[PDB]
Scaffold this active site. Structure first.
Site, PDB file in Angstrom:
ATOM      1  N   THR A  13       6.052   0.033  -2.790  1.00 41.12           N
ATOM      2  CA  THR A  13       7.019  -1.070  -2.727  1.00 41.12           C
ATOM      3  C   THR A  13       7.883  -0.952  -1.464  1.00 41.12           C
ATOM      4  O   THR A  13       9.112  -1.179  -1.477  1.00 41.12           O
ATOM      5  CB  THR A  13       7.923  -1.179  -4.017  1.00 41.12           C
ATOM      6  OG1 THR A  13       7.109  -0.971  -5.176  1.00 41.12           O
ATOM      7  CG2 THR A  13       8.586  -2.570  -4.080  1.00 41.12           C
TER       8      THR A  13
ATOM      9  N   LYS B 220      -4.848  -3.344  -1.052  1.00 36.68           N
ATOM     10  CA  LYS B 220      -4.307  -3.308  -2.398  1.00 36.68           C
ATOM     11  C   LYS B 220      -4.477  -4.696  -3.015  1.00 36.68           C
ATOM     12  O   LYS B 220      -4.148  -5.719  -2.390  1.00 36.68           O
ATOM     13  CB  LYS B 220      -2.837  -2.886  -2.392  1.00 36.68           C
ATOM     14  CG  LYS B 220      -2.216  -2.754  -3.776  1.00 36.68           C
ATOM     15  CD  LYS B 220      -0.760  -2.320  -3.689  1.00 36.68           C
ATOM     16  CE  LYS B 220      -0.140  -2.178  -5.072  1.00 36.68           C
ATOM     17  NZ  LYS B 220       1.296  -1.793  -5.001  1.00 36.68           N
TER      18      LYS B 220
ATOM     19  N   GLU C  32       2.343   7.716  -6.166  1.00 41.82           N
ATOM     20  CA  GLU C  32       3.059   6.808  -5.320  1.00 41.82           C
ATOM     21  C   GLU C  32       4.498   6.664  -5.830  1.00 41.82           C
ATOM     22  O   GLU C  32       4.718   6.146  -6.917  1.00 41.82           O
ATOM     23  CB  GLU C  32       2.346   5.453  -5.348  1.00 41.82           C
ATOM     24  CG  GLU C  32       2.954   4.343  -4.514  1.00 41.82           C
ATOM     25  CD  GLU C  32       2.224   3.018  -4.727  1.00 41.82           C
ATOM     26  OE1 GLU C  32       2.864   1.996  -5.135  1.00 41.82           O
ATOM     27  OE2 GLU C  32       0.996   2.999  -4.485  1.00 41.82           O
TER      28      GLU C  32
END
Lengths: 201, 201, 201, 201
Positions: free
Chosen positions: B67, B127, B38
């Site tokens: 993010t 998440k 990621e």
């Protein structure tokens, strides 16, 4: 090019059983600090591996071809973007071709007669192979009659003797199985051990 | 996609101070056996890093973006070839966009209320962040009322507790600083230690 | 022919001071189990010895000629019924002659450059000489760039190291003074010791 | 000439950093009992040193030239009165020139193939170089196939092993740094130690 050898002081001589193995090993080596990687034509479709590793060139790698044993192989290596051509032996036909294409070429020698035959072609950097046979002593002997010739031994280099090759006065060391044998992680760790040992001598 | 998480059982959540650092770290992680990477938008020109790492996709990597905190960032991540979008929070606007583009999206939750709000949008993988705050206990508690929701905790995962997260019943673990902090070689070694520890539990 | 080398795994390289000595030594060697005998042209009237030992061919021996250093010597060796020609060195003129006559020819090499020059003539079995100088290490080094070349070292082979040459991966070993020095009885006994030691490794 | 080698049994292979150093070292060597001195073309203005040392010839010295690597150098060495020409390698062009001028020429070899190529030019005395690499064993191996060839090793000869080279059966030994490194007095003393050690074996 010569300057790059002097700066990095190590070449990985990469042999693999498949295209996939070769690419993963090239990465394991790169990350450790070994920026010179030689893709041998003993790897199936070695030509493919040289082209597909072109993304490393942008990161500061210089990718060449090894075990180039004919003009036909050499042309494929250069067309595929090889940054330098290395042979196991001294070959007049390949030396001529590379000169026209302007690609640095490092022939192999083992004997003073092969050495002089190379110098007459204008080569001042020579591959010394097999290194373990001739040993560090060969380099010390050659310093005498040929102060202006420098060697890159291949074969027999390991973490117990790599500093003896440098104390004799070689240009750089090529490392084979002693580096690249093992898993992708183990290889990266071995590579670090070599760079630290060289910078330390 | 879900199937890929189940198979690999680890995500690297990569943060770096520069474009150059990010690419070298992505490689260190890949080689160790962590195929899910990621690329956080806290990396300068994160978008560039996602595109230039496209050569890893061919080697079996799945590269996503992290993010992602606005629809504007998300669009750039998808256009640049991100394989999945991860946010720190639950966002209705991003969830809608990704659905239209058909790109797997994993929102963040911390509370049962955020959880249910996500489920109404059709998300079943969430998440869990920050993991170290809510702890392994959160997952055990949620199993009760929501047997059909699975978590990927991020934050706080390390070689002393990674197996407790799996025994609770998570889908996969995301690892941040505990993995990716260190030199390119040290990182590769840490990555190996994680994969072996997970396959062992 | 290659098949015969693989089966027997030993060659006697026979040197003598007279015609009479040579014939008696050839018999001492044969009986012990060494079916490949090379009659060197350092034996006076070597040509005679090759012809007069023709009665061994019927018993399963294969008798060749060694230390053949000119096309003139080679022709005499072939006309006299030699089953194979061995030289101390690589010679283009002899290689051409033998090819036309269809007689197996094993040139000598010591260096990668001599090696490649031989391969271009179509030879895949090479005599490695002097073996004691280059050592077992030479063979291990050559396996890398030339997986399809096999060596028969001559010189330096003895009952303490004959198994190291085989573990490196040679085709067969040639034995000189370490075998054939001594009385006709002592020689037969030494020959037995070699065959047993090879079959044991 | 051959007879002179057999009588004296030692050659000094002289290297220096200046014309002045070379002349003083030649004297240090002469006085000790080493009547054969080879002035290498690695000495600046080596040609001058060969001519100006002509006063030693009258005292029983035989002064030659070493590290002669082109026909152009060779001609200057002969015109300047060199008593013999030594090369580091086997060279067809120099061999031809010397023959016409009637000046003894000792080529270098390292391998059986180089050896035979020399013999076809009519040379029976060969320089074996680098000696320390091939070792004393090389000479013992060559005695077999080439009873009529004799070697003068250069490199690696010292007061601990000089007698092993003679027991193998060399013609004479050439000594480099092991002799001529040191002050003019120290060199003279080392020279005495060599002559006494040889006459003693």
């Amino acid at each position: 090019m010569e300057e790059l050898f002097k700066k990095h002081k190590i070449v990985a001589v990469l042999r693999a059983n498949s295209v996939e193995e070769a690419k993963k090993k090239a990465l394991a080596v790169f990350l450790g600090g070994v920026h010179l990687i030689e893709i041998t034509f003993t790897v199936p479709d070695a030509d493919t591996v040289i082209k597909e590793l072109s993304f490393l060139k942008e990161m500061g790698a210089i990718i060449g071809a090894g075990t180039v044993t004919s003009v036909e192989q050499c042309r494929k290596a250069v067309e595929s973007g090889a940054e330098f051509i290395v042979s196991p032996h001294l070959d007049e036909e390949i030396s001529q071709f590379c000169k026209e294409k302007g690609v640095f070429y490092m022939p192999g020698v083992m004997t003073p007669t092969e050495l002089v035959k190379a110098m007459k072609l204008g080569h001042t950097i020579l591959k010394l192979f097999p290194g373990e046979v001739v040993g560090p002593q060969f380099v010390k002997a050659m310093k005498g009659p040929f102060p202006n010739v420098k060697f890159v031994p291949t074969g027999g280099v390991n973490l117990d003797n790599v500093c003896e090759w440098f104390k004799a006065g070689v240009l750089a060391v090529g490392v084979g199985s002693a580096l690249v044998k093992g898993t992708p992680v183990e290889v990266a760790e071995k590579a670090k051990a070599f760079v630290e040992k060289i910078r330390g001598c």
